[PDB]
């Protein structure tokens, strides 16, 4: 059955990114691994907050994180992006860790 929750290999992480970094920049690629077999160890990625106006998206397959707007320290200085890594197990197992982004002046 579904023994193992996915385990993050590269979260938590604090990224510093220069303000003026435009929309459409892939800033990171999250990796979580699941020891379980087949469907029980196929990992998918989402943000914890379903909020549709975030300045970052994560691709559910690749775990690639991309800007959706120009970063501006005067607008948001720090993002704590909670990433959920889930397996496709019949009971779904998941882990959450934070990609923190600090916008440098
Ligand atoms: Ca699993």
Swiss-Prot record:
Glycans are attached at residue 59. It is found in: Cell membrane. Residues 9-105 form the Cadherin domain. In adult animals relatively high levels of expression are found in testis, skeletal muscle, heart, eye and thymus, and lower expression in kidney, lung and brain. Found in the sensory hair cells of the inner ear. Disulfide bonds: none annotated. Interacts with USH1C and USH1G. antiparallel heterodimer with PCDH15. Isoform C1: Interacts with CAMSAP3; leading to inhibit CAMSAP3 ability to induce microtubule bundle formation. Three calcium ions are usually bound at the interface of each cadherin domain and rigidify the connections, imparting a strong curvature to the full-length ectodomain. Cadherin repeats 1 and 2 mediate calcium-dependent heterophilic interaction with PCDH15. Cadherins are calcium-dependent cell adhesion proteins. They preferentially interact with themselves in a homophilic manner in connecting cells. CDH23 is required for establishing and/or maintaining the proper organization of the stereocilia bundle of hair cells in the cochlea and the vestibule during late embryonic/early postnatal development. It is part of the functional network formed by USH1C, USH1G, CDH23 and MYO7A that mediates mechanotransduction in cochlear hair cells. Required for normal hearing. It is linked to Defects in Cdh23 are the cause of waltzer (v) phenotype. Waltzer mice are characterized by deafness and vestibular dysfunction due to degeneration of the neuroepithelium within the inner ear. This is Cadherin-23. It comes from Mus musculus. The chain holds residues 883 to 987 of 3354 of the full protein.
């Amino acid at each position: 059955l579904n023994d193992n929750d996915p385990t993050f290999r590269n979260l938590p992480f604090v990224a510093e990114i220069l303000e003026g970094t435009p929309a459409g920049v892939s800033v990171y690629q999250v990796v979580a691994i699941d020891l379980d077999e087949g469907l029980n160890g196929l990992v998918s990625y989402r943000m914890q907050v379903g909020m549709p106006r975030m300045d970052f998206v994560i691709n559910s397959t690749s775990g690639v994180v991309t800007t959706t707007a120009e970063l501006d320290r005067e607008r948001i200085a720090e993002y704590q992006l909670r990433v959920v890594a889930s397996d496709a197990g019949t009971p779904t197992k998941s882990s959450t860790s934070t990609l923190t982004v600090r916008v440098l002046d």
